[PDB]
Amino acid sequence: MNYGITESVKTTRSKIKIKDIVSDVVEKKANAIKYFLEGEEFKQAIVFGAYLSGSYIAYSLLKDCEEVIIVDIQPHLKDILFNDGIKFMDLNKLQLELRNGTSINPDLVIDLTGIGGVSPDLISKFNPKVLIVEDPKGNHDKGISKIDNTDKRLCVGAKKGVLKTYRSSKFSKTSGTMTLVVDIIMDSCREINELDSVLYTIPNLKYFEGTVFHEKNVKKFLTELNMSAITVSSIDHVEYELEEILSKNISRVDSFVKEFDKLA
Amino acid sequence: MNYGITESVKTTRSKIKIKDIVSDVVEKKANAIKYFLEGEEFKQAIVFGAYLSGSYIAYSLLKDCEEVIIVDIQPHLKDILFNDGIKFMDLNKLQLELRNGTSINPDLVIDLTGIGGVSPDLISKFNPKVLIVEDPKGNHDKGISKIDNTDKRLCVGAKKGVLKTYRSSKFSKTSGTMTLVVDIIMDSCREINELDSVLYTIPNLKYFEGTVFHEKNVKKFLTELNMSAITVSSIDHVEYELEEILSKNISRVDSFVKEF
Amino acid sequence: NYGITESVKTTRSKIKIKDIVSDVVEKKANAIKYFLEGEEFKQAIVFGAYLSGSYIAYSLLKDCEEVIIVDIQPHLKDILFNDGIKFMDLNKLQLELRNGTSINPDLVIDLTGIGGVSPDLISKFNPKVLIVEDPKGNHDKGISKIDNTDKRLCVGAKKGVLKTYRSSKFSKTSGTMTLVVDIIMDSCREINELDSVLYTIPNLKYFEGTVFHEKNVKKFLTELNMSAITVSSIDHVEYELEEILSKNISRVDSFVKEFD
Amino acid sequence: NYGITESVKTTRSKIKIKDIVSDVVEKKANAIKYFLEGEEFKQAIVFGAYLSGSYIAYSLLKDCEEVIIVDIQPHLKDILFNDGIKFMDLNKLQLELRNGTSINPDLVIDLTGIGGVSPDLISKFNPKVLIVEDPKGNHDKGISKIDNTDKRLCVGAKKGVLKTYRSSKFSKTSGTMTLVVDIIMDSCREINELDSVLYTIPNLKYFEGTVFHEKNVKKFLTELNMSAITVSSIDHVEYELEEILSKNISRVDSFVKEFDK
Ligand SMILES: Nc1ncnc2c1ncn2[C@@H]1O[C@H](CSCC[C@H](N)C(=O)O)[C@@H](O)[C@H]1O
Numbered sequence A: 001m002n003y004g005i006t007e008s009v010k011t012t013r014s015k016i017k018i019k020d021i022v023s024d025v026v027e028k029k030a031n032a033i034k035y036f037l038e039g040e041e042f043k044q045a046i047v048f049g050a051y052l053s054g055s056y057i058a059y060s061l062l063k064d065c066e067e068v069i070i071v072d073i074q075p076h077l078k079d080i081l082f083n084d085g086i087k088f089m090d091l092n093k094l095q096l097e098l099r100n101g102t103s104i105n106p107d108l109v110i111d112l113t114g115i116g117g118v119s120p121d122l123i124s125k126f127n128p129k130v131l132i133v134e135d136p137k138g139n140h141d142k143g144i145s146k147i148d149n150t151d152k153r154l155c156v157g158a159k160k161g162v163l164k165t166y167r168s169s170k171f172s173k174t175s176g177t178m179t180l181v182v183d184i185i186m187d188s189c190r191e192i193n194e195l196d197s198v199l200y201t202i203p204n205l206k207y208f209e210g211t212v213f214h215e216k217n218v219k220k221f222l223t224e225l226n227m228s229a230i231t232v233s234s235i236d237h238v239e240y241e242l243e244e245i246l247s248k249n250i251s252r253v254d255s256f257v258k259e260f261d262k263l264a
Numbered sequence B: 001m002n003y004g005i006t007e008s009v010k011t012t013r014s015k016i017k018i019k020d021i022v023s024d025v026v027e028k029k030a031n032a033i034k035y036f037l038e039g040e041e042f043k044q045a046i047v048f049g050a051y052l053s054g055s056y057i058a059y060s061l062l063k064d065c066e067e068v069i070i071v072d073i074q075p076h077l078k079d080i081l082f083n084d085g086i087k088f089m090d091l092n093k094l095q096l097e098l099r100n101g102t103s104i105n106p107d108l109v110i111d112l113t114g115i116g117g118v119s120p121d122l123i124s125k126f127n128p129k130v131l132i133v134e135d136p137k138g139n140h141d142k143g144i145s146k147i148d149n150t151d152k153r154l155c156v157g158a159k160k161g162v163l164k165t166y167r168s169s170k171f172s173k174t175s176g177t178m179t180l181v182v183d184i185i186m187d188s189c190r191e192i193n194e195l196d197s198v199l200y201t202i203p204n205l206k207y208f209e210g211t212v213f214h215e216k217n218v219k220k221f222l223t224e225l226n227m228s229a230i231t232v233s234s235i236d237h238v239e240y241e242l243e244e245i246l247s248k249n250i251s252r253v254d255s256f257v258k259e260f
Numbered sequence C: 001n002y003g004i005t006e007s008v009k010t011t012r013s014k015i016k017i018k019d020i021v022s023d024v025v026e027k028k029a030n031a032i033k034y035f036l037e038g039e040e041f042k043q044a045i046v047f048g049a050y051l052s053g054s055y056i057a058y059s060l061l062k063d064c065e066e067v068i069i070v071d072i073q074p075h076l077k078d079i080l081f082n083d084g085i086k087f088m089d090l091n092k093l094q095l096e097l098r099n100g101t102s103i104n105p106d107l108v109i110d111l112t113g114i115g116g117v118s119p120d121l122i123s124k125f126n127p128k129v130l131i132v133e134d135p136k137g138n139h140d141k142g143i144s145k146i147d148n149t150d151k152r153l154c155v156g157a158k159k160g161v162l163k164t165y166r167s168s169k170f171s172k173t174s175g176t177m178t179l180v181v182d183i184i185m186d187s188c189r190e191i192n193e194l195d196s197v198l199y200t201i202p203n204l205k206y207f208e209g210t211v212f213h214e215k216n217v218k219k220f221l222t223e224l225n226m227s228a229i230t231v232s233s234i235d236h237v238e239y240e241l242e243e244i245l246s247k248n249i250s251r252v253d254s255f256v257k258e259f260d
Numbered sequence D: 001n002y003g004i005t006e007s008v009k010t011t012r013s014k015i016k017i018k019d020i021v022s023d024v025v026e027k028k029a030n031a032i033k034y035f036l037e038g039e040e041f042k043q044a045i046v047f048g049a050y051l052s053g054s055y056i057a058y059s060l061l062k063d064c065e066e067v068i069i070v071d072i073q074p075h076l077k078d079i080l081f082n083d084g085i086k087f088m089d090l091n092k093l094q095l096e097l098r099n100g101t102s103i104n105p106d107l108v109i110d111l112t113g114i115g116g117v118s119p120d121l122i123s124k125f126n127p128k129v130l131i132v133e134d135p136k137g138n139h140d141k142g143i144s145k146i147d148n149t150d151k152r153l154c155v156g157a158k159k160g161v162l163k164t165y166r167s168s169k170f171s172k173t174s175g176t177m178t179l180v181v182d183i184i185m186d187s188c189r190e191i192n193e194l195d196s197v198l199y200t201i202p203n204l205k206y207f208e209g210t211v212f213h214e215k216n217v218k219k220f221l222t223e224l225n226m227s228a229i230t231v232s233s234i235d236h237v238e239y240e241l242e243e244i245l246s247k248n249i250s251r252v253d254s255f256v257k258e259f260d261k
């Protein structure tokens, strides 16, 4: 900790970093999938969508899956991959290998693309034992519900599930990792600002999605996540309360896979 | 605007930049002082505190003062002045010139230092026609009220005034330019996020004060203010609502000098 | 018109609590109507008379030869406003199911929600259409744990889940009472920020207590006749008051999600 | 204790509206006491009986030989709970000032606020201490325009402005009623976010109407006996309910700002 303009004001940066919030949310999504799979083993798993939770989710499936393949429409996202054991395939390469080849016949398909993502037509080409589709919808919004087609994507699999992620007692427009991280920080700032002696509270946010998809720079994106989530200007010490508010907001994240019953 | 991850999601950056919010706030504070002065002319004006509103306030005072001197405890803040007509003096040079010299005898003294700023003892050494002290307090906070000594600073001047700045119907901990800018952006984000089709809203904020006082880099600080105040991810267009919400939150800023 | 003195105005909203209740129950009834696609039924059974059940049963009289409301509380027969709707307490329905053939509905609607109808009772029917109201609103761990909506969708050739939310706003349940309270509370927050408003009063009380503890439907209906909000202000706010309330009422979105 | 069924709990707060009112009036009375520094007075005049005036006038009985409450509404004599407090309506005070020497207070306290006593009436006194309650809370252009607190501080050797705010929270005025309503409304917002809560009811009504329109102080006092909040939830929330209310009551800060010269 340091001082601000003069020694009468303190500047406190949270120990909790943006990457720590991202890690907690992705781990909750990976654990939801793990719980839903009930320790079942698979020959080949295909995970659509590398950013932002896909990387850690694919890595978490290596223990029970002989082969894990991440599929992404953006080839540069091979850089966001967690481990060498995860195979990366461009959408162009997958489509080609499906038409002319027998190497692709997964028993576990996980769709994490969400809004404007994979089409139900591509999903229908598979015949897995388990199909998991991530529902990008958070709390109610007409515009988001209209563009969402999660139900149409659950067209294959003996066992089907929908990965849902919300914040308990708080409003979020989507279940997206980025949306949730931003909402956790924003909600923490509003409460932090009400602590006695606080002058102002800064959420250290920027359009991180732009660094990944517009600048096509995964390395820079990961560096940007290394910043303290919040910076506070105050007369008195707030370091304790600052981590407790952030932690409380991170703990509200609840992720689970809802099983979709289809008897045939 | 542009698209986000796919063409199904739009990315919109506000036309309103952080510098535009800063400019609106500083102009409101400068206008409050102008309205309070009622067109009175002065031989020498001394303004304590260059950052953040002081620079524009001193510039605006050249219309009514023969000489305008910005005084700051940080010598590198001479870089935040944008007009050569504004004279700069660090606190030590001023204190020395007061003891051994007659060149300093202002008829207009403006204290914008706020929390942990200029002591009432230094203010008591002047005998101006008008004294304006900026109250750093915003809405009620016990910790901030305890450290504040604005009333003790109003110890000289034939006419005395307290520059106050608040947000109508909204809570702000201080009247500081930076505090107001941050609160305007944060409150705008809260309302923008509730617009139909919005996925998430990003306030493009950072600890700008750090760039000025810790990195001692005014140039970099000014470059950082060129960023769009808010970035929005949405399914539908939100261009108008984005600017209208930020505009509405900037309009809530009310600055005025209360005469004592 | 005035408050303590003639310098302050007292404004009571033209929108009454009953008007908010009516709008919500009509949205739920319309969601069911849209989902039914004009299909006609010989016998409809609706579980849960309070609070939307009464109007929902009334709206089924056109396309249903017989509409029966079932409630665990016999005094809730008083909340029905049309003699064409038959009433049966839960014990009477259970008796008639064991010893009788008069009950064999082609349309079953469960509106009991939390701690309501058991899936075991629902499993005794074989209708053409089954509609179960999901009491869950936005995410809450405690509410999700007690909810068993999915287990209740165990019969019917066509199955649907009635869902009700507030667009861009948080609500713990889809319950009529919850939504009405939330609409009023959110309206108060925005009304209080209007210029010149001193304070805003939501005219609320534990209405559920009048119905289930005092067992007085008549008194409950009389209590809903109150203006939703009372405002104390310096200037006129009548227009803004009705606009803020209407806007919050319009966020209610009700629909039946078909379960394939 | 249960709601519609035994699966849902109904909890009424132990804290009653009267308890919130009492805490706010006591904070205002204590602010005045601190400011007076134990000074004794021959005659104190307090303008405005509702809502904090009654308890403030009561707290002045110890250090003042005579305490007179002045209210434009004669029925507000019913809100006084001690016979030691003399009551005079505005008309009687105005008559006694013109034709009489019985009124010459050394302590004048104006609690009328918005549309209250005129500076012209205040200027007719020459007390040792003058305290004017500032009705303004946080910033609002409309309230600021109608407010004339500064013009009311025209007499007294020692002058003070009674200010009351909520730390870190927005309130349009310093009025007892406004603060009570805001404490309850803010508590409801936080209570509703507790896990398992279905909905939260603030037990509010236009209490001011009972006092000034129905002219019924007795009924108004009875209406304050109600629990401040009623909660519907799946799990127990009794302790959190009380903690959030107490926390919001504790944010009230009242103090008299001394006006020099
Ligand atoms: N048709 C398609 N096939 C494969 N990947 C796709 C796709 N459309 C989009 N994607 C990828 O899927 C991701 C969409 S972003 C989804 C966010 C994610 N559910 C989370 O919560 O973190 C991006 O990596 C994008 O490049």
Ligand SMILES: Nc1ncnc2c1ncn2[C@@H]1O[C@H](CSCC[C@H](N)C(=O)O)[C@@H](O)[C@H]1O
Pocket: A005, A006, B048, B049, B050, B051, B052, B053, B054, B071, B072, B073, B074, B077, B091, B112, B113, B114, B116, B117, B118, B119, B134, B175, B176, B177, B178
């Ligand atoms: N004793 C002193 N003399 C002169 N300048 C001082 C000072 N103490 C602090 N300052 C300066 O005054 C400023 C304090 S920041 C005040 C913020 C300003 N009122 C606003 O709203 O924009 C800084 O520029 C700091 O360097």
Ligand SMILES: Nc1ncnc2c1ncn2[C@@H]1O[C@H](CSCC[C@H](N)C(=O)O)[C@@H](O)[C@H]1O
Pocket: C047, C048, C049, C050, C051, C052, C053, C070, C071, C072, C073, C076, C090, C111, C112, C113, C115, C116, C117, C118, C133, C174, C175, C176, C177, D004, D005
């Ligand atoms: N097992 C059961 N059988 C029939 N009715 C029941 C029941 N359990 C509860 N009820 C009734 O169903 C209602 C539950 S309250 C449900 C609120 C309603 N969905 C709304 O939004 O308005 C009450 O009328 C209650 O008495």
Ligand SMILES: Nc1ncnc2c1ncn2[C@@H]1O[C@H](CSCC[C@H](N)C(=O)O)[C@@H](O)[C@H]1O
Pocket: C004, C005, D047, D048, D049, D050, D051, D052, D053, D070, D071, D072, D073, D076, D090, D111, D112, D113, D115, D116, D117, D118, D133, D174, D175, D176, D177
């Ligand atoms: N000119 C006047 N003289 C005396 N009393 C007046 C007055 N105008 C209004 N009043 C009274 O003063 C009170 C105004 S309400 C003020 C609220 C009070 N400050 C609080 O916080 O509780 C009412 O009792 C009203 O009848």
Ligand SMILES: Cc1c(O)cc(O)nc1CC(=O)O
Pocket: A113, A114, A115, A116, A136, A174, A175, A176, A177, A178, A179, A180, B004, B005, B006, B009, B199, B200
């Ligand atoms: C959830 C989601 C999505 O499915 C698609 C997209 O482009 N953005 C988001 C928001 C996010 O990534 O948080």
Ligand SMILES: Cc1c(O)cc(O)nc1CC(=O)O
Pocket: A004, A005, A006, A009, A199, A200, B113, B114, B115, B116, B136, B174, B175, B176, B177, B178, B179, B180
């Ligand atoms: C108002 C203020 C101040 O007087 C002193 C300081 O160090 N910080 C602030 C906050 C700000 O600049 O907004």
Ligand SMILES: Cc1c(O)cc(O)nc1CC(=O)O
Pocket: C112, C113, C114, C115, C135, C173, C174, C175, C176, C177, C178, C179, D003, D004, D005, D008, D198, D199
């Ligand atoms: C939704 C709901 C419910 O299913 C059961 C109960 O007891 N209360 C509510 C809340 C309400 O009526 O709004």
Ligand SMILES: Cc1c(O)cc(O)nc1CC(=O)O
Pocket: C003, C004, C005, C008, C198, C199, D112, D113, D114, D115, D135, D173, D174, D175, D176, D177, D178, D179
């Ligand atoms: C403060 C105040 C006032 O001075 C005059 C009035 O009519 N209403 C209020 C509001 C209140 O009593 O809370």
